[PDB]
Amino acid sequence: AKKMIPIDDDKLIMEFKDDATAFDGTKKARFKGKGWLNAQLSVIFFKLLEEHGIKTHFIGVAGGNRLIVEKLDMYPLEVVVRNVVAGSLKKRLPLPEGYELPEPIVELYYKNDELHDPMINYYHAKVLGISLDEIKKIEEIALKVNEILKDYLAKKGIILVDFKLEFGKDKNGDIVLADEISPDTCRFWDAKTKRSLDKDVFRFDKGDLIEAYKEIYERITGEKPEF
């Protein structure tokens, strides 16, 4: 869904594409303007998190669908935080879609195509070269990001159902929030109707993706998308 283009030893161009993919790449479509929306929303979320003292890779914008970001030594992880039961959590817990969790759940996934991103725990992570201290710091950050995003979104009639983060290490060996934060990588539900305003619209044919992503953008910024 994104192009990464080097600049020097220090930074990268992160370009968001109009392509959407689901079910291990077996479902595909293109949505004009999706790249733009995902980029803008990432910018907005990264700026919010920075103000709250979250170290992120965001440096700046490079016009349109492109962000300027700090190059990191990436952890091969996808870190999922979950507030409300949806998606794959229904295969691990005998709870219905929409069940409100008594506290957030953090799941670790091994980012590995050959193995299709299997869930892992702290012991697997250690065998992968990720110390317990590092894992603990990663989850601590993910849970803080959760709090800030859910609070900020709740005040806008949006429930943060779950979401995925990625992380890397900077030259100082600090753990820095990376990749993207968009309706591609989060579940957003309208607080009243409880309907999806995210990639689930594309996954399960729930309506128009662009319209749902625009709606998210409008309800967050108070403005209509210019493209």
Ligand X SMILES: Nc1ccn([C@@H]2O[C@H](COP(=O)(O)OP(=O)(O)O)[C@@H](O)[C@H]2O)c(=O)n1
Ligand Y SMILES: Nc1ncnc2c1ncn2[C@@H]1O[C@H](COP(=O)(O)OP(=O)(O)O)[C@@H](O)[C@H]1O
Cβ atoms of 145 and 165 within 8 Å: the answer is: yes
127 three-class SS: helix
Q: Which is nearer to ligand X, 84 or 130 (CB)?
A: 84
Cα-Cα-Cα-Cα dihedral of 193, 198, 202, 207, to 10°?
30
Q: Which is nearer to ligand Y, 44 or 74 (CB)?
A: 74
Q: CB neighbours (10 Å) of residue 173?
A: 8
Which of 32, 91, 155, 224 is in the footprint of its own copies by CB under 8 A? Answer: 91
Instruction: State the pairing for strand pair 19-22/27-30.
Output: antiparallel
Of the candidates 19, 172, 199, 213, which has an alpha carbon nearest to the alpha carbon of residue 224?
A: 213
Of the candidates 35, 34, 31, which has an alpha carbon nearest to the alpha carbon of residue 16?
A: 35
Which of 24, 114, 133, 223 is in the footprint of its own copies by CB under 8 A? Answer: 114
Q: Which is nearer to ligand X, 11 or 22 (CB)?
A: 22
Residue 139, H or E segment: helix 132-154
Which of 18, 70, 117, 170 is in the footprint of ligand Y by CB under 6 A? Answer: 70
Which of 15, 18, 117, 170 is in the footprint of ligand X by CB under 6 A? Answer: 117
Binding mask 71-110 for ligand Y (x = CB under 6 A): xx-x------------------------------------
Smallest distance from its own copies to CB 117, Å = 10
Report the interface residues with its own copies, using CB under 8 A. Answer: 91-95, 101-108, 110, 112, 114-115, 118-121, 123-124, 126-128
